[PDB]
Amino acid sequence: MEAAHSKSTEECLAYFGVSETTGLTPDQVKRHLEKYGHNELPAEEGKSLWELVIEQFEDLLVRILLLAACISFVLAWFEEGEETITAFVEPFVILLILIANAIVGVWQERNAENAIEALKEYEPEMGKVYRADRKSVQRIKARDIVPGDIVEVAVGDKVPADIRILSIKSTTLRVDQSILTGESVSVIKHTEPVPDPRAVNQDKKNMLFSGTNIAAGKALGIVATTGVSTEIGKIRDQMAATEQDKTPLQQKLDEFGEQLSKVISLICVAVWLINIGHFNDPVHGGSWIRGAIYYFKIAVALAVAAIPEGLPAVITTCLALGTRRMAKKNAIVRSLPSVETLGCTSVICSDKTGTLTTNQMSVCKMFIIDKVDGDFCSLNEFSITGSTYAPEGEVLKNDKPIRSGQFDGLVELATICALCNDSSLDFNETKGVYEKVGEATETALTTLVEKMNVFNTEVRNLSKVERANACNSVIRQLMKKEFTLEFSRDRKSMSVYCSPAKSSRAAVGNKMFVKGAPEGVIDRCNYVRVGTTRVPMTGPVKEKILSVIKEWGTGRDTLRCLALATRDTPPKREEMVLDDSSRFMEYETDLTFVGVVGMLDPPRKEVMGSIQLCRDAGIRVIMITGDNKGTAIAICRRIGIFGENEEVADRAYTGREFDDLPLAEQREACRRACCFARVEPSHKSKIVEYLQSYDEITAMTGDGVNDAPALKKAEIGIAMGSGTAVAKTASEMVLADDNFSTIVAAVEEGRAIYNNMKQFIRYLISSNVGEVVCIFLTAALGLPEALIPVQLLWVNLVTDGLPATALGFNPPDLDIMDRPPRSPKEPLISGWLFFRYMAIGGYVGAATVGAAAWWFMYAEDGPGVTYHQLTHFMQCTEDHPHFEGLDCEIFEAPEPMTMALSVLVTIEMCNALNSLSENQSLMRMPPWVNIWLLGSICLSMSLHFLILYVDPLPMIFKLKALDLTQWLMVLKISLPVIGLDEILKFIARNYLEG
Ligand SMILES: C/C=C(/C)C(=O)O[C@H]1C(C)=C2[C@H]([C@@H]1OC(=O)CCCCCCC)[C@@](C)(OC(C)=O)C[C@H](OC(=O)CCC)[C@@]1(O)[C@H]2OC(=O)[C@@]1(C)O
């Protein structure tokens, strides 16, 4: 391996000590191969079903359930009555539930995918090398390519490794480095070295990246780095090193079981102490192990009582629906759990051009030197109409139509835009629209010529599929494109070498047409053309030129400027090495300015407003672009990131400025800044680190593998619909429409979902609290079981779930977007709210137990010891004549249970409603505010009545109710809950919170 790109062709050949015409020798291979290993990325790791199901049974709760299911299973086998043939339901059900979860997670993860897996899609199976054990090129498996061997690639091949170019055989080499950046635009590779050792891939012009494709050409090169050491290999490392935390909800839940667990074992401790009398009174007689079974079978009740068995199903079904929802709004969210974290986004870093703007360019202004005399200088500003690349529009001066032709400067300005352009227009029939062909900024300048036919030629007499390129075509035939000197970020500009068409324009012949950033060119300008005539560049005219350029790109116009020039007497062709880049800037000098051109990348409509929502939302927004700081800011102002006259010194940095700062200040800059200019590689990733240090939930965008590491590290990495596959696999969400707006919209659904989600959680949990109270009392008093796990299950899963998932559709608040994002550290239940369900539950636990016990005493269908003796119901068949007098089995009666449970059910269909709002009376927030909530409650009730009226179902449970004598009892017990709440709710007025 080596830092080749900085080293010369010979330097690399020496390093690895290899022959360019021979290749590595079988010894060198074995050696190298050993030292560097094979050319591939470590394999994937995926827990087997075993490992899966094992974690599926790793949750403390699911564990607690498994133990519980066992105990029950053990207890069922301990009877010996033919009628106790139902005992195998309780355990069998729990297991189903448990199992069903495992069945999910296994099919869940199962259909997932790693972004690191996506990368291996870039690893081409074969490759071509030249090794000493043969003279012709060998076609071997990339896996076996080694650092140092001479490699060969061409037109269709996928570059197998990070290769330094040794020699280009075709007349030109082109590469599609999009898997890296995403830009489909091919680039030209050379052979000479690049000085900077810390140079970004972009400027490694003599380098070939493992993953990219050869757009056009054929070349020979020497392998620099392999496997994980290659540009793409580094990324894979970063993405694997990165660890993503759990959704705050998943956090909050794990925290719940952790506690749910401690309480449980504590109750057993209390319970045991309440029945500790058995150490000083027991007649050491029989029923000693008919008492153990009690504390045991009462345990598994306690468990299913404690766990919100159905919650998981509710949540997931909620998230899915919302997902499917967001999808309609163009937000493609991949992991359901994200929807939570999304609704909490603190900061959003959005790339500019693709999402904030439309990436649809068009020239608005022009300006050619009109007159220079003394210090008196006069320009010639214009305007151009038409936002589509469409050839439809008019050139104007002071908003008055004009014939570009009448001016010379323009005629040239035009020919330059027509010959220093590697793009083109095209018209499709499928959707009758004018489509860009080359690059955005060029495919525009071409549109600029069509709109301004400098030599008034027909056209209106031509079809659209001809009109698109019929003014350019003309200028293309007045001069000959000898070759071009490509754009390189060093000299920020480009130029085409031209010779005329013999006898028609051979006045001076060989010309050089250059376009590029205004700064660069204008310096390299020693003359200015005042329409068909030249004058030496001079102090004032230069200032006038630049000045307008600043206004155009800083002013409300926010335009991108391309100063245009031509080299009247270029050097002689033979005096030019068209294959080594350093000399281009030298070739593009002693120039004559012929005009600058401005163009606009229009923010999207929804942006202006979305940007405002976020403000309202207290969600910060940061733009990341490639625009010079000066312009970056201006555009930030035009959209609302900044105020028209707001101070921004400390709020917007440039990629470089940022490096020149210390890890300390670096951090500050981030929590306050809102605009990053020309940001290099790591910057994205680093910024996500500083925005996380302040514990902010942040979103990132981007689409090439270059940004996979940031997308993975952001709390919500965001990919583009038209982005690459890896980026997507590395992202939590995907804007099918690439639109910034789509982001916010989504952030909002997330805030809505959670609110409702949040409620049904509180709903289910609370009941689970009361269920336990019941089970406690039932054991603290000694009273016969009031409720059975089975019943309980059915409840928490169905009778209670439907209303839960129903509340999921709770209409959204109105100020959802006027409130700061939620703090992740916000507990679902605490304070006075803790107190309410502290109460409610305590109520159901009394209501329930009381009701069943009621049937025992005070009931007209099986009276009982109104003296409370029922408490020793254990002792019945024992001392029958010991106050018993009657049938020793009424305790095992079914009706008393059907009491305590129907009291529960109703108390829930009730408490369900008390949850439509956390603090609003129902007289304020009526139950019909959500029809599903009511619609479901009914579905659950009929269901309840289904377990009673069917014949199979009842047997597993309790018997029917005696409506009006027994049912009314239920109601005079339950309904009162609503009030208890309303009362406690009303306590929201007597305090200061609303
Ligand atoms: C589900 C049923 C029960 C009985 C339970 O043990 O819940 C406790 C518990 C673990 C918490 C408490 C429960 O505390 C009690 O109910 C007191 C025990 C008295 C009954 C014993 C009879 C002798 C929650 C349920 O209830 C109230 C209202 O007091 C609210 C909340 O839970 C949530 O926000 C849900 C988490 C998704 C948690 O305080 C939570 O602890 C936490 O870490 C939280 C933040 O989680």
Ligand SMILES: Nc1ncnc2c1ncn2[C@@H]1O[C@H](COP(=O)(O)OP(=O)(O)CP(=O)(O)O)[C@@H](O)[C@H]1O
């Ligand atoms: N095809 C081209 N040839 C020569 N100069 C060009 C050009 N396209 C743009 N320019 C000018 O050169 C300067 C830089 O070009 P560069 O290719 O880095 O821009 P870019 O802003 O399009 C990158 P990004 O796509 O990330 O926003 C620009 O600021 C512009 O003034």
Ligand SMILES: [Mg+2]
């Ligand atoms: Mg460009």
Ligand code: NA
């Ligand atoms: Na992520």
